[PDB]
């Protein structure tokens, strides 16, 4: 029953506008005033609240698209989920005051009972459910895509020289990042042919002890595959962590600069220096 619901919302639009006027006073009043003016906010709110009540008790596809657009606009404009929740709370408060003054419900009678009373609240809850669903539809999607971008930019072995491979890593790494780095380095070195592999540790401020242990294990493993691992440019603090780890440290050949690493690699491949 959205017909008389729409008729009553046609009168409650002014109550919602007055409620918005009341609510801009409490939370970030200068910010709310600056981001949106009164007429634009009023028209946006009434357009957001009047289209759904015209649907036949189920939904509105155009209204669903407009609701997604409104949700993203308020999220990106200065009305986060906390602000939308405060707006819902004040909506309920002022609708409660409106009935305590107006007292006009779906079923026309001398005094309607509490069935339509709570049908109003169920419909409002459904409206807010649609709002939060629109809010959460795409945020996890962009979180997923940024996680994919973070993981794909982890260990680019694509830097390649003649029979020489180099993998630069610069972002701070954790256990998952360390596993990704070792797996990507191993799959790269098994894919393309190489004689030495230079890991640019310069750029990472601090690593955990287990992370450094995995790095040493990866160096030994890629040595096992048949490629020397020259850890190039280790910071003093990672050196501290590696030494306090206590693992054996004779095989790992290290140079403080990538240019020196390249010349050492060209020294190992004796005729590649020419």
């Amino acid at each position: 029953m959205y017909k008389d619901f729409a008729n009553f919302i046609r009168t409650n639009k002014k109550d919602l506008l007055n409620n918005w006027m009341n609510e801009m006073e409490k939370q970030s009043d200068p910010l709310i005033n600056d981001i949106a003016k009164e007429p634009m906010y009023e028209e946006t709110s009434i357009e957001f609240v009047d289209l759904i009540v015209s649907n036949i008790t189920e939904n509105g596809s155009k209204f669903n698209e407009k609701l997604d657009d409104f949700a993203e606009k308020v999220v990106h404009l200065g009305w986060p989920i906390h602000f939308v929740t405060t707006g819902l709370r004040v909506f309920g408060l002022l609708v409660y005051t409106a009935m305590r003054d107006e007292d006009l419900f779906l079923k026309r009678e001398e005094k309607p009972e509490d069935d339509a009373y709570y049908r109003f609240e169920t419909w409002l809850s459904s409206m807010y459910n649609k709002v939060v669903t629109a809010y959460a539809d795409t945020w996890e999607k962009t979180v997923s895509i940024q996680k994919s971008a973070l993981q794909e930019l982890s260990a680019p072995l694509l830097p390649i020289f003649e029979k020489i491979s180099v993998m630069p890593l610069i972002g701070t790494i954790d256990t998952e990042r360390a596993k990704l780095i070792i797996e990507n380095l191993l799959i790269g070195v098994v894919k393309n042919r190489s004689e030495v592999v230079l890991i640019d540790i310069t750029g990472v401020p601090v690593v955990d002890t287990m992370v450094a242990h995995h790095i040493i294990q990866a160096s030994e493993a890629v040595r096992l595959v048949g490629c020397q691992a020259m850890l190039v440019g280790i910071r003093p603090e990672i050196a501290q962590t590696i030494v306090n780890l206590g693992i054996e440290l004779d095989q790992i050949i290290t140079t403080n600069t990538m240019k020196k690493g390249m010349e050492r690699a060209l020294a190992l491949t004796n005729r590649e220096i020419v």
Binding site: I182, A221, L224
Partner: peptide
């Protein structure tokens, strides 16, 4: 070259 998974398993 022992394959990377079995390489780390060996090491």
């Amino acid at each position: 070259g022992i394959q990377p998974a079995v390489a780390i398993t060996l090491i």
